[PDB]
Design an enzyme around this catalytic site. Structure first.
Site: not given
Ligand SMILES: NC(=O)[C@@H](O)C1CCOCC1
Ligand SMILES: NC(=O)[C@@H](O)C1CCOCC1
Lengths: 265, 264
Positions: A186, A188, A223
């Site tokens: 995704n 991330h 992050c």
């Protein structure tokens, strides 16, 4: 892998790979953490998830890791077969918990154990919320009813409060950035990457003379792909203990905090 | 995994893992490259190499990758079983070659192929050399005698000369540093990490609209654990790019390569 006979937990075997091991020719803690994540993912697939339920998807809700705690007694060697058993549990309206037990396939002995706390959040607003009753019932049919804890002890390390590292840090590793291999499907940053970043500020001499026994990590903020991170460590202590902090390289916004315990090799 | 019936090649199956896939929910080229490296190590173990021979150990000699070329037709999806067959070959005194064929376990169709060129060197002085004669003998009993090439076409992409990218680069990703997960068991930077660093300077828009079809990478110098790297890319065109990895300070070349991408 497969769900156990009662359908309330999931087991999977893994053969340790050449690139998965460190200088001791044994699997790294990041390899262990990736394997826990893989067995968790296969457990969710085996009972029809993804770990979003049908109701969560309707409300744009996701499960997010708040804490990860891992205790390793023996790291599997390159070529060894490690068997991992995992299960989930409802913790009322606070959230959910996922536990793991690691075993040596040949001896059947427990070589490690892990626990993780998860919280519910709106995927778009990033706003945390308590678990709704309709959601709570939907996953309770896949969890054991009686408590089953990988860390059952009276006052165990997995539930200890972690303080904030005060400047100046004793050690630091600056300018850490994720690359595409650090991102999941995704886009991330993978939760295991933060474990690696925390350990980057541990001096090579501790790594070469000690073995990592316990790691407890709190996840405060994510992050982003284009963020830069600073890793900070201070000795709090034969055993060695450290306090850790991951914060954004610029403004100093906290993304993680943790503790590690190491024993002399 | 296991050596085939004739003992001249090795096969292994792998189930694609959740963290091994990209946005398209298919294995990344770095996952593919890690799997080739794994089947290569298991092949060496199965014929007693721990890839140093008996004479190489006493002489302080190691095999080092000079070039890696990979062509993927289909990336295996998350959960798929991929079967990889690998073998080695002597290339006279130049060095040795390791080839791979990737297949879909369910259909038996070839989904990719790879080739790598290896050279001999003293692990201490880092000086290259011609293999030998008493070392060639030890290798030739584990390799097919007749040529067996994953890339047989006369003068194909795997054997093309790669030029040096001229400044200014069209794109760049600077300040790349390896972490402990990027190091192997001997504390050296894993060869697959350099593939990742090369791809870091490809814009996200190409990655999102194209699929990586071919990658050819030359290894010139190793990146030390405490070195910082700059990744440089320029479009030469399907989309083709020229790549350069060099040290962030002095600009010392560590790798050069080319990638070919197809519109999704
Ligand atoms: N998917 C998961 O279980 C993750 O949240 C964990 C995996 C182990 O490393 C820490 C994060
Ligand atoms: N061990 C090996 O086969 C390595 O040299 C390769 C692995 C995959 O591609 C990069 C280099």
């Amino acid at each position: 892998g497969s769900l156990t006979e009662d359908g309330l937990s999931y087991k999977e075997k893994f053969v340790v790979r050449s690139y998965e091991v460190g200088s001791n020719k044994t699997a790294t803690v990041e390899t262990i953490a990736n394997l826990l994540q893989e067995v968790g993912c296969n457990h969710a697939q085996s009972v029809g998830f993804s770990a979003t339920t049908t109701t969560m998807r309707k409300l744009h809700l996701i499960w997010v890791t708040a804490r990860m705690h891992i205790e390793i007694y023996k790291y599997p060697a390159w070529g060894d077969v490690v068997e991992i058993e995992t299960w989930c549990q409802s913790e009322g309206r606070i959230g959910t918990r996922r536990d793991w037990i690691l075993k040596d396939s040949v001896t059947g002995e427990v070589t490690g154990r892990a626990t993780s706390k998860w919280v519910m959040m709106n995927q778009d607003t990033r706003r945390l919320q308590k678990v709704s009753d309709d959601v709570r019932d939907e996953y309770l049919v896949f969890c054991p009813q009686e408590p089953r804890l990988a860390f059952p002890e009276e006052n165990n390390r997995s539930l200890k409060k972690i303080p904030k590292l005060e400047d100046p840090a004793q050690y630091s590793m600056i300018g850490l950035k994720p690359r595409r291999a650090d991102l999941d499907m995704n886009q991330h940053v993978n939760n295991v990457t933060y474990i690696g970043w925390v350990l980057e500020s541990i001096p090579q001499e501790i790594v070469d003379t000690h073995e990592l026994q316990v790691i407890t990590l709190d996840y405060r903020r994510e992050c982003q792909q284009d963020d830069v991170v600073d890793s900070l460590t201070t000795t709090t202590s034969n055993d060695s203990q450290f306090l850790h902090l991951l914060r954004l390289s610029g403004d100093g916004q906290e993304i993680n905090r943790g503790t590690t315990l190491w024993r002399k090799k």
